[PDB]
Design a protein around this ligand. Structure first.
Ligand SMILES: [K+]
Length: 351
């Protein structure tokens, strides 16, 4: 039993109410070291299609408890590997556990997580996402985002109707003129619809700076074709769930940018995807699922600490109505500001 032994692992459901979708059914992970330093991680399972649940996630963390109790948090990378070998499919569970262990490690040695990952910056500039409505409400959202002091915006499109999608973009670009536009196609386009969408954006000089996952993951060839021909930077999200995916992307030119979501791969795997990306000269985006200031501030500590991320998409704290946390990043406008604080800097409220 030395100061960095794990004597306590606990997981509890956290249901965080949202402003406009209803609840982020997430899990708070706590690891406690023998010296009393506490590390916090968050699991955010998103059950779309073949997904994980809050209930399945908590149960996975309870199963993984016996594998970490009594172990030295100092073997963080070894422990991350054995979690992945025992419970690969519970990505959100392993992410929260990895976040917690690293938080504990760095808080123990009094080191900021952004310094542990590289120390390049203490500041990120995030976009903000437009909800839905119609063409009228999207123009109003575009104006509302830029009035908050946020430079770039993210828009979700359905991809089934090029004409409607374009009309939404026109409005948004007209309403918010100096905003770089990141467009999340959410696997909805095919090659023809993606190319025709891009061609029109170019023709109208619509400032899309990223076309995010326009096609389904399985259309590897189509993804590559859009990447090669469209004249826009393309991001891989669903196509990028592992380091193996990222090697494939680099090889086939599947996309030109990787959206890292630590919730989907875990931390150690995400670290390898970053290094593959940077060495292939792919751009890096950092995003998340429906996550509180906890998981988001961890992701922010990595993006800022590593360096080299051109796209920051860490805006879900602005959509959470309330939560039990203090600290983390400090947002002013679209600027996320990090501090001379050990770990990720997010803590639980007192009273
Ligand atoms: K996304």
């Amino acid at each position: 039993s030395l100061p960095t032994t794990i004597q306590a692992i606990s997981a509890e459901a956290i249901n965080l109410p949202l402003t406009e979708p209803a609840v982020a059914a997430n899990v708070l992970v706590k690891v406690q070291l023998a010296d009393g330093t506490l590390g916090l991680g968050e699991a955010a399972p998103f059950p779309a299609v073949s997904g994980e649940t809050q209930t399945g996630t908590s149960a996975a963390i309870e199963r993984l408890q016996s594998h970490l109790l009594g172990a030295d948090v100092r073997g963080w990378r070894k422990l991350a590997a054995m979690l992945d070998h025992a419970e690969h499919e519970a990505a959100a569970a392993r992410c929260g556990l990895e976040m917690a262990m690293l938080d504990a490690l760095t808080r123990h040695y009094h080191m900021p997580l952004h310094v542990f990952f590289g120390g390049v910056s203490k500041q990120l500039e995030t976009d903000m996402t437009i909800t839905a409505g119609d063409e009228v409400h999207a123009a109003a959202s575009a104006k509302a985002i830029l009035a908050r002091g946020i430079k770039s915006i993210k828009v979700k499109t359905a991809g089934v109707d090029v004409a409607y999608d374009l009309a939404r973009l026109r409005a948004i670009h007209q309403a918010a003129p100096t905003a770089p536009l990141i467009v999340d196609g959410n696997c909805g386009y095919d090659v023809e619809r993606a190319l025709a969408f891009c061609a029109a954006c170019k023709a109208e000089s619509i400032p899309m700076v990223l076309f995010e996952q326009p096609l389904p993951r399985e259309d590897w060839a189509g993804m590559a074709q859009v990447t090669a021909q469209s004249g826009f930077a393309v991001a891989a999200d669903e196509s990028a769930r592992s380091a193996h995916d990222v090697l494939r992307i680099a090889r086939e030119g599947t996309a030109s940018v990787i959206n890292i979501k630590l919730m989907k791969a875990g931390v150690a795997e995400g670290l390898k995807m970053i290094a593959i990306a940077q060495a292939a000269g792919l751009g890096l985006m950092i995003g998340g699922m429906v996550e509180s200031i906890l998981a988001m501030s961890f992701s922010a500590n990595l993006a800022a600490g590593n360096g080299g991320f051109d796209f920051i998409d860490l805006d879900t704290p602005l959509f959470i109505a309330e939560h039990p946390f203090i600290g983390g990043f400090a947002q002013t406008g679209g600027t996320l500001q990090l501090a001379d604080v050990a770990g990720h800097g997010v803590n639980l409220e007192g009273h």
